[PDB]
Design a binder for this molecule. Structure first.
Ligand code: NY0
Ligand code: NYI
Length: 335
């Protein structure tokens, strides 16, 4: 087997001349030459006790088929459960991701507009399958050399469940802190489509300035960053928060003024800021939905609902059992 950075990466003979891309959420990612399709590809190594998030992602990505969602091209594993240890997931090679790109490149308004269009196009398909991504952020948006964009990392995704979204104040949450909607900290488990729209709003703001808009250092500081720009919520929006611990927290804070979007983003297109405002709405019930965002004047050059496909149907879902399910889900790639 070939080795990369003093670690086995056993994907041959189909895949050869490996080069390190980076570390991913569950292990090493390398590029490799695919000797069958005659293109370089990306390969993620997953080592185990496995993680339910590996299975959830595989099930979702194998069911999904969309231009703005990363596909799984191949899955490499031993032929039997007894011999199975590492699993390698092969995907299309992508030059970069939005996190890397924003560290060093100023985006043109045309690039911001096109990127946002593609994020929302992909998200429309995800939401049409009654699935929530729940961890949208720059590093989960892959880009190729022509700036085509694909959403990745579905390990925190869930089927939408608005009737069970409510929870108490300060409920622990798993998804990346800077892209968490305010309601996560107040009364939400992140089981409604509005949580993803907030993350997209955050991404849009970050594309406008190359800096995260709400870089909280810890759980409650995330909320205080948000309120520091949106200002204090209105009486009407507070009345929507029936949880008393959450409501009384917000009532305990000093009045905070709204920061005008055009003062934070003096370079931004005015239509981009009208759409940003609608995505970063405090009240999730008032927040714009994915199809309305696509129909917003900012995206008029691209909007074409006939070319914004949806899923055919809604998506639906012990350590030994988990390993057996991963083995079964990956069976189609075996010779
Ligand atoms: C969501 C991240 C992902 O799927 N990939 C695959 C890829 O093409 N690039 C990449 C680089 C570093 C970490 C993860 C990924
Ligand atoms: C403190 C809760 C509260 O005032 N309301 C408003 C209501 O009108 N009815 C209602 C129904 C179910 C839950 C909460 C509520």
């Amino acid at each position: 087997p070939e080795m990369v950075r003093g670690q086995v990466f056993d994907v041959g003979p189909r895949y050869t001349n490996l080069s390190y891309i980076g570390e991913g959420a569950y292990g090493m990612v390398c590029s490799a030459y695919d000797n069958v399709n005659k293109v370089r590809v990306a390969i993620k190594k997953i080592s185990p006790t496995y993680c339910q998030r590996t299975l959830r992602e595989i099930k979702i990505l194998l069911r999904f088929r969309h231009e703005n969602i990363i596909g799984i091209n191949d899955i490499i594993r031993a032929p039997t459960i007894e011999q199975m240890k590492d699993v390698y997931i092969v995907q299309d090679l992508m030059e970069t991701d939005l996190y890397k790109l924003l560290k060093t490149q100023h985006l043109s308004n045309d690039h911001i507009c096109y990127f946002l269009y593609q994020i929302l196009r992909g998200l429309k398909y995800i939401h049409s399958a009654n699935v929530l991504h729940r961890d949208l952020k720059p590093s989960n948006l892959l880009l190729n050399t022509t700036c085509d964009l694909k959403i990745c990392d579905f390990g925190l995704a869930r089927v939408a469940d608005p009737d069970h979204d409510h929870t108490g104040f300060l409920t622990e949450y798993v998804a990346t802190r800077w892209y968490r909607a305010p309601e996560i900290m107040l009364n939400s488990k992140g089981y409604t489509k509005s949580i993803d729209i907030w993350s997209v709003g955050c991404i849009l703001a970050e594309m406008l300035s190359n800096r995260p808009i709400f870089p909280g250092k810890h759980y409650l500081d995330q909320l205080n960053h948000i309120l520091g720009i949106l200002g204090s919520p209105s009486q009407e929006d507070l009345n929507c928060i029936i949880n008393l611990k959450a409501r009384n927290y917000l009532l305990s804070l000093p009045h905070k003024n709204k920061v005008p979007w055009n003062r934070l983003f003096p370079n931004a297109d005015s239509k981009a800021l009208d759409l940003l405002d609608k995505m970063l709405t405090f009240n999730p019930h008032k927040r714009i939905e994915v199809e309305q965002a696509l129909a917003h004047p900012y995206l008029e050059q691209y909007y074409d609902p006939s070319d914004e496909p949806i899923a055919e149907a809604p998506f639906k879902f012990p350590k030994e059992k988990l390993k057996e399910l991963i083995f079964e889900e990956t069976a189609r790639f075996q010779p």
